[PDB]
Amino acid sequence: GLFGAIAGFIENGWEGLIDGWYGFRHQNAQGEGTAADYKSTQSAIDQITGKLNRLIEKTNQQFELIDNEFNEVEKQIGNVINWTRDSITEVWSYNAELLVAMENQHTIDLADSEMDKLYERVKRQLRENAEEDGTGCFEIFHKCDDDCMASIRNNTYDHSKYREEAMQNRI
Amino acid sequence: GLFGAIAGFIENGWEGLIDGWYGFRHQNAQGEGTAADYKSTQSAIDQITGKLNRLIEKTNQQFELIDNEFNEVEKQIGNVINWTRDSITEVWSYNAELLVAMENQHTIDLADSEMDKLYERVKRQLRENAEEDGTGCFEIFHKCDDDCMASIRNNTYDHSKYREEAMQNRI
Amino acid sequence: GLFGAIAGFIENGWEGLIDGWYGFRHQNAQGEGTAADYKSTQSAIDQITGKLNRLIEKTNQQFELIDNEFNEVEKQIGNVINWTRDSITEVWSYNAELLVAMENQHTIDLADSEMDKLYERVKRQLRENAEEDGTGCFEIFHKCDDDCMASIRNNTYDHSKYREEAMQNRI
Amino acid sequence: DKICLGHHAVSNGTKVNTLTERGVEVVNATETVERTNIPRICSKGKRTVDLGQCGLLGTITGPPQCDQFLEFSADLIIERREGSDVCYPGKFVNEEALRQILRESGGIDKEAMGFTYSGIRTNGATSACRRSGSSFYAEMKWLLSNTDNAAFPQMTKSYKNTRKSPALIVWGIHHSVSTAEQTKLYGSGNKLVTVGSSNYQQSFVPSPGARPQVNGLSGRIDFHWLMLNPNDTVTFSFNGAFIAPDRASFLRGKSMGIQSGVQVDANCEGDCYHSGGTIISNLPFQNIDSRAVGKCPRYVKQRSLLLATGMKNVPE
Amino acid sequence: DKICLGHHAVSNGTKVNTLTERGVEVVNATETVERTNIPRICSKGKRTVDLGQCGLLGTITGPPQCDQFLEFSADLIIERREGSDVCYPGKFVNEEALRQILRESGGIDKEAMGFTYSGIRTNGATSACRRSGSSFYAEMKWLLSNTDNAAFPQMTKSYKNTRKSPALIVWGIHHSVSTAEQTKLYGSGNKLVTVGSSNYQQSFVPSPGARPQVNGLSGRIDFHWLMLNPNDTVTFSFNGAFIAPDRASFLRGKSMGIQSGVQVDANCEGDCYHSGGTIISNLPFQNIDSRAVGKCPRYVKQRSLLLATGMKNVPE
Amino acid sequence: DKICLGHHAVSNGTKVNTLTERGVEVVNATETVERTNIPRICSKGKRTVDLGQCGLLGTITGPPQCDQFLEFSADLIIERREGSDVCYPGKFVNEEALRQILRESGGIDKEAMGFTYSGIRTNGATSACRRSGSSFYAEMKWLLSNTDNAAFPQMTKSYKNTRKSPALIVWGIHHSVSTAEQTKLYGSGNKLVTVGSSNYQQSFVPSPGARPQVNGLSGRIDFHWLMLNPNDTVTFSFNGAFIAPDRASFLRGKSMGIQSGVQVDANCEGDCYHSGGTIISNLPFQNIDSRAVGKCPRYVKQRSLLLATGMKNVPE
């Protein structure tokens, strides 16, 4: 993707993440945990869903018969009709192919974007209390128990509360 | 947007910013100020304007009458004409709808992108002398008067001049 | 581009980089060096090549003669045929113009993105041992000989091995 | 202590195509091309007429197989391969134009044209149009001389359309097997039919001569037609070999016509038809029949185009 | 001390549509579909002919209503609903083809064909073609016998196109209301008109009979035409019922033709016309008339398609 | 110590267009629009027939220039500008429809219709159809009276299609230069040709008269044709002015026809043809000829559309 997270510095996805599109996996002395992030998941779902509803918008155009399946029309006008119909069919086959390909490129890139946005949100939450390891994880330079992890996940983590300890541990 | 600044970590826009698309709002002992950044504003304006000029490029094939509004043409050829014209109309309505949607998606993402480019530019100017608060602001860890702020806006801020003081203030 | 690397904070390209699309230019006590990065180059090349192979996908629709170049067909049916063909020609001229314009926009943005992904990769390799200067260079705060540079380029640089020295130089 | 950001995945994703790549796996995808056909004409909510053995053009002239449709009314008209416009051998001139007019007519409403005759027979009949005996087209009259080889009087018949929509006017030309038969029926000499309105003028001459027997008969009756504008008058001038109209037709409203070979189902409802059934779908494209009519998904040549609805799938 | 990066916004933005969303507010947008029509035919810079009561085909044959247009020259030709091609009732074969030929002709330039006659009258006239009295088509001659019921001599008249572009040749076949009129005008007996060139061969027999009265007359004239290649010859062989051409037409250059119901305005300049006026626009699409002609924005069914020209609007 | 990230560049790149900009310089680009023409008809693998001076319709009647093509077989049929359908002047009814039938026929297979004559001449010939002397159409017979001005006997000739595909039947109506010539060839009096099948019947009267000399002759032939269904019969009833068919045609299979002015090359292989040669290309668009036929790149009006294959070029 254009943002190099989903197929990039995040090496693969989590098949156990069944509760959302994006999420957090934490590690501390109390153990390991995995939870889904609602805001990013719903953001991506909302954009792809809006795209889908956009693509199935119905427009009422009626076309009638100009050919004859039982008694073939005159040769010259029949060849003109056949040429026109085949040209239009080619135009719409091209439009469908291009439309689906472009939409797919953009969908993949948009999901990549939402992943990167979640990662950056957490990075700005942690401020000077953590460092990126380069695989999508933040090494936290202070003890972060389950309540601390939960405060990161629901955006109530106060970096000042741990700053002096973490800064000292980074030097 | 794909870039997550506009309508992203920057929570809303400034209705008082009437002289540019992007800008700086500073706070120091002398008070608060708002000024526009010319380079990013002009970059976005140039790209959207180029898109606009591209979309109104005149390449005009001339078409003549093949129907008759006063004396209807023979029925069969008139039906073929009407079928062809309706098919072409549907194709061009589709082209217009898709084109405008895609161009609008890209325009929004491009403005988002230019905002992020300005943000990252300032971050790299400040180096080790400031920290991001996560809402589009840079907490500067030294006294920065109006001339200092102006040096940030016009890309003459020398981080070395304040480095040792600022990094000391960060402990 | 949307990612503001190429033609962005990287001021210009290297005409001496003849063995790849992206690369590293280092300087240390042993002198200056330039090397190409294989992964980013091959990633971009693979994506543009896939796009190209997509655009030359062959579809084998046959169209036959429906007018006459030597003995002109009847006037009215000839005018209809010419109108239909000119409409189809305008549709395909539009499709070609828009397709090439869109694909070119996306190609430029994709190369910009791969450049930015390489830059971010190196930044995360270097961790706390270097600082960005704002022009695409990383000021390294420890002695980094040719083997050290080579380890940065092939992703074997162990930041811990130099952290103590580097941190001691950054404060 | 550490916290890691990640995304979901599945073991087996769905391959889709993009601008740069074929067969990239994504977590989820959905089909845009419709392939499922309902092999019936779903006609709920539509006044539907299955013409069966009646050819659509016959509804204007009225051979026996069309007796039940002489003034039909419909929203959907179904033509069948066994439909015939004629009973006595012959054909319409400019038949496809008239079929296209009648497919969207909503049906026809007949009105007497008021032609009366004297000095001739009006009861021409044939064993090819059987209604409990030798008969003829219910809407036409085969004008003959009073007795064999008698002279057919020169005649002029006019009809004015007093209604607010154009009137469909039809007449016939009889082509005898020989000049002797034509003389036996209408008297000797050249035969001429002139037809005129304010925007129409055309002449018709019978073409007597030997031809193969169709159902045992070698004569023909070819039907011709015109649309008569309001306040406009049609005038026929003839001296024989003329199949006169008894009634004119007016179009009822709107409809659509299809040609099908599958049964009608008044228990499913649809709006897109082809000869093989009905296309019922919310998908924007279909790969079933490029000649479908109604309100239809756009026909494309691809059988499948998967649209990604999830991120790229990166399993472990 | 701190410094904050931000972007502009407005209190009331403009809603646009994207690939993923309908009605997202952006700071600014601009219309791409043209709806504003100028209810006049803007003809500045173009030599313009408003045919008015002259029908376009009449310019070739010359009924009175077309006397001022017998050799017209134009870049833009305007047909009106009240235009008539005829005075003596009749119609052209392949009329729409000829109309399309004349709309792009740039006008016509007439040249005498040099036919001289002996033993016949050439001043056939009718009060349906009034020029201070009974007259006829200005470019034609109604050939009659010298006296009532006299025999019409068999004649052959040839014309060679000596110019460098094809010559438009028009003739007529006259269908009298009755055998007595055809006899009075051309003498009794069979009538035949054959017309031939190097790429054209056709034959005509008159069909007398009553047709509805148009302009007081129940006879009709069939007008036929051909394009005579340079150095080629057209030959007419006739013995009556023949409306002869007096002059041939040559196309001047290039023009375009429209059908309108609004006045001409030589003070605005435009290149896209419909019956209701002129579309003057820089926008790429229009929702005014799907049958507009000239150099036009593309017709689309949508009345409005707003293009974003600013960032997303995020107010306070 | 520092390490810098960068990208490659060149001193002079190639300019392309994007959605927002014209002439942005990129490191590399490739053309999508084909402009290179091969000025020959590449026919490897295809049975090709170069008609040369033979007009395609002539293959049915057989003027001298078509003797080599009377039963041709081909996958690709090439018409040339010098092709002629006739020797004795004349022209076909619905000529272009028949050309389109023959372009896709794969060639024709002739079979004798079995007409024999007595009491007339059958060897009518002209110096306009020269085969070492005066001759005629190889597939027709110009039926004449036994001696000058002698009466041509009334006769009827029928042919039944005993094969499994429709038969192409062609006949002619001869129009002499004058009544005297028609009398000399077929005797005085009325002449009539009636043609009938199960779905076709038509009468023809020759129309003698002077026409311009084409190939030295002032008479003309009207060529008519029909498709005779299997087991159906075509019947000709005539007393003169009738060009009888000697053989019927059956379509061999399938082919396509082109019109070219360049030589054939059986050593190059192609699938897209125009009058100037063959388009052999992997590019998706072409700017050579909008009327190219076969399997072709799509014609576009642009002569060049450069697709970026590299990053933006920012030189030093």
Ligand SMILES: *[C@@H]1O[C@H](CO)[C@@H](O[C@@H]2O[C@H](CO)[C@@H](O[C@@H]3O[C@H](CO)[C@@H](O)[C@H](O)[C@@H]3O)[C@H](O)[C@H]2NC(C)=O)[C@H](O)[C@H]1NC(C)=O
């Ligand atoms: C994988 O993608 C498919 C395709 O989008 C997803 O199926 C979609 O699911 C939603 C809700 O589950 C459906 O919304 C529906 O809206 C209709 C409106 O008429 C309503 O009647 C239904 O009750 C429902 O709310 C949507 O139609 C449906 N789309 C298709 C094509 O079936 C599917 O959920 C995705 N899988 C996962 C795991 O997300």
Ligand SMILES: *[C@@H]1O[C@H](CO)[C@@H](O[C@@H]2O[C@H](CO)[C@@H](O[C@@H]3O[C@H](CO)[C@@H](O)[C@H](O)[C@@H]3O)[C@H](O)[C@H]2NC(C)=O)[C@H](O)[C@H]1NC(C)=O
């Ligand atoms: C909201 O968007 C519209 C549309 O882009 C803006 O109007 C545009 O303003 C520019 C400059 O003010 C106009 O550029 C013009 O270019 C032509 C070249 O032919 C030149 O002759 C003019 O002198 C001018 O330089 C542009 O035409 C105009 N567009 C339209 C459709 O009027 C508008 O300014 C935007 N609103 C705000 C508050 O920025």
Ligand SMILES: CCOC(=O)c1c(CSc2ccccc2)n(C)c2cc(Br)c(O)c(CN(C)C)c12
């Ligand atoms: C998935 C394909 O659906 C479409 O092609 C259309 C679509 C959906 S494609 C699209 C997707 C996102 C944004 C804009 C368009 N829209 C909106 C149309 C609007 C009009 Br008007 C129109 O004529 C069509 C053509 N239809 C009738 C075949 C479409």
Ligand SMILES: CCOC(=O)c1c(CSc2ccccc2)n(C)c2cc(Br)c(O)c(CN(C)C)c12
């Ligand atoms: C450069 C343009 O090439 C194409 O037009 C097509 C292309 C290539 S453009 C493209 C590129 C990426 C994704 C989708 C389309 N594809 C795949 C087509 C698929 C079908 Br089905 C099709 O009818 C066409 C139309 N061709 C036959 C004129 C194309």
Ligand SMILES: CCOC(=O)c1c(CSc2ccccc2)n(C)c2cc(Br)c(O)c(CN(C)C)c12
């Ligand atoms: C907004 C729509 O305008 C256009 O359709 C076209 C436009 C503008 S849309 C566009 C924007 C960026 C890139 C390509 C097309 N261009 C450039 C065309 C180029 C050619 Br060649 C062409 O045939 C058309 C078709 N027009 C004449 C009906 C367009």
Ligand SMILES: *[C@@H]1O[C@H](CO)[C@@H](O[C@@H]2O[C@H](CO)[C@@H](O)[C@H](O)[C@H]2NC(C)=O)[C@H](O)[C@H]1NC(C)=O
């Ligand atoms: C966000 O997470 C924090 C951390 O778990 C929540 O704060 C705790 O809430 C639980 C249950 O209400 C208490 O037992 C803890 O004592 C709380 N810890 C602190 C430091 O206050 C917080 O409630 C969560 N926010 C929301 C909206 O659910």
Ligand SMILES: *[C@@H]1O[C@H](CO)[C@@H](O)[C@H](O)[C@H]1NC(C)=O
């Ligand atoms: C048009 O195409 C159909 C098949 O789609 C074919 O059967 C028919 O013969 C064609 N019409 C003509 C006039 O060739």
Ligand SMILES: *[C@@H]1O[C@H](CO)[C@@H](O)[C@H](O)[C@H]1NC(C)=O
């Ligand atoms: C074609 O459509 C127009 C309306 O756009 C209609 O008025 C006209 O009657 C139609 N022509 C035929 C031959 O049905």
Ligand SMILES: *[C@@H]1O[C@H](CO)[C@@H](O)[C@H](O)[C@H]1NC(C)=O
């Ligand atoms: C930037 O602002 C500072 C402070 O006023 C000034 O000294 C400097 O000259 C400015 N630079 C430019 C390029 O205007």
Ligand SMILES: *[C@@H]1O[C@H](CO)[C@@H](O)[C@H](O)[C@H]1NC(C)=O
């Ligand atoms: C159609 O276009 C061709 C070439 O553009 C031209 O030679 C021909 O005359 C046109 N047909 C008619 C009927 O005008």
Ligand SMILES: *[C@@H]1O[C@H](CO)[C@@H](O)[C@H](O)[C@H]1NC(C)=O
């Ligand atoms: C990376 O470079 C170092 C220094 O030259 C070398 O020792 C090491 O083997 C390299 N690693 C790989 C994977 O090539």
Ligand SMILES: *[C@@H]1O[C@H](CO)[C@@H](O)[C@H](O)[C@H]1NC(C)=O
């Ligand atoms: C109505 O028809 C009559 C013919 O009987 C005609 O005289 C009259 O002008 C017509 N009315 C209109 C408004 O055309």
Ligand SMILES: *[C@@H]1O[C@H](CO)[C@@H](O)[C@H](O)[C@H]1NC(C)=O
């Ligand atoms: C027509 O004839 C003249 C002389 O009679 C000759 O100069 C001219 O070239 C001819 N035109 C053509 C097209 O052959």
Ligand SMILES: *[C@@H]1O[C@H](CO)[C@@H](O)[C@H](O)[C@H]1NC(C)=O
């Ligand atoms: C430029 O692109 C073309 C087409 O993709 C390719 O053949 C050529 O090798 C490329 N040039 C370079 C220097 O890679």
Ligand SMILES: *[C@@H]1O[C@H](CO)[C@@H](O)[C@H](O)[C@H]1NC(C)=O
């Ligand atoms: C034609 O008739 C023959 C016998 O006369 C019969 O064998 C053949 O099957 C028939 N063909 C068709 C197509 O009906």
